[PDB]
Amino acid sequence: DIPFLEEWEAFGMKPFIFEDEYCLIREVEYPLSHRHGLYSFSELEEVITLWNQSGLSHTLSAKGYNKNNLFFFDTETTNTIFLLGHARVYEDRVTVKQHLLPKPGNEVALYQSFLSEVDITSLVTYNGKAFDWPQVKTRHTLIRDRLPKLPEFGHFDLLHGAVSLGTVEKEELGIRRLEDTPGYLAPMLYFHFIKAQEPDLLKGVLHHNEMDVLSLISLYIHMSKKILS
Ligand SMILES: [Mg+2]
């Protein structure tokens, strides 16, 4: 039934089965010492502390939040989301998790896996246009109770009142990507994937999205340190 499952598993992608549907889930771990551009992910802890000690009212204030509450979130689209990526920073590590829609008609499985795990009220984002949340028809209570709470932009909107992520990476964060698959190619790659279901078509897209969510961490740190200096 589900094709290329062995090939997907080598890439760290496994299926999540739900209600006669499925989605594909990838998980990568990084050490807290990992440097992504100028900053190691361990500097997040410092900026969350400084925010909690700050009397400054700001859209990016982490006052009242712990570092684990923040979901660094980025999506790819085809117009609707087909890839949900997020990173989360814990005491020993950073976890990147990606939920891939294998084709239209699997949205219940996608939302069941994503909404089970992500606090959609605490997203850190860099999205210019409002999120194109996929449409879904379900009885399930977890999903229905969230559809109208699905935000246009993250709570921590890194683009607030304000430029491409690539340009910020190079000019501000000191991040250089090797042989990146650009976001504007994801639609065409995904369109061909729907038919052929060959993992090779999306491995580059999945790496790009992974690099996206890590850069959101580096950007949040960068912007916070500028503010709290
Ligand atoms: Mg992206």
Q: Report every protein residue that has its C-beta within 5 angstroms of ion ligand 1.
A: 74, 183, 212
Cβ 166 vs Cβ 53: under 8 Å: no
Query: What letter does residue 172 receive in the DSSP assignment?
Result: I
**Nearest alpha-carbon partner for 153 in 198, 120, 196:** 120
Cα atoms in the Cβ-side hemisphere of radius 13 Å centred on 119: 15
Spacing, Cα 75 to ligand 1 middle (Å): 6
The CA 205 to ligand 1 mean position distance, Å, reads: 9
What's the half-sphere exposure (Cβ side, CA atoms, 13 Å) at 157?
Answer: 16
Q: CB atoms < 10 A from the CB of 73, how many? A: 28
CA of residue 139 to ligand 1 center, whole Å = 31
Task: Report residue 71: phi and psi, to 5°.
Answer: -110, 110
CA angle 142, 155, 94 (to 5 degrees): 80
Q: Cα 35 to chain center, whole Å?
A: 18
**Residue 216 CA to ligand 1 centre (angstroms):** 10
Find the 46 Cα to ligand 1 centroid distance in Å.
26
**Separation of alpha carbons 75 and 83, rounded Å:** 5
CB contact at 8 A, 198 and 90: no
Q: Does residue 44 come out as left (phi exceeding 0), alpha (psi in the -120 to 50 range) or beta?
A: alpha
Rounded distance from Cα 53 to ligand 1 centre (Å): 32
Q: How was this structure determined?
A: X-ray
Return the closest-CA partner of residue 213 out of 75, 60, 66.
Answer: 75
Rounded to whole angstroms, how far apart are CA atoms 14 and 109?
Answer: 13
Residues 91, 101 contacting (CB under 8 angstroms): no
Task: Give the DSSP letter string of 112-161.
Answer: HHHHHH--TTSEEE--SSPP-PPP-----HHHHTTGGG--SS-SEETTTT
Residue 100 C-beta-side C-alpha neighbours within 13 Å: 25
Dig out the tokens for 85 from the structure. 């990526």
How far is ligand 1, taken at its centre, from the CA of residue 197, in Å? 21
Q: Resolution in angstroms, to 1 decimal, for this deposition?
A: 2.1
Structure token digits, residue 224: 């916070």
- The Å distance, Cα 142 to ligand 1 centre, comes to 26
Each residue of 31-66: b (16+ CB within 10 Å) or e?
A: ebeeebbebbbbbbeebbebbeeeeeeeebbbeeee
Listed residue (168, 167, 166, 200) closest to 183, CA to CA: 166
> CA-to-CA distance for 109 and 21, rounded, in angstroms?
6
Closest C-alpha to 19, from 106, 81, 83, 82: 106
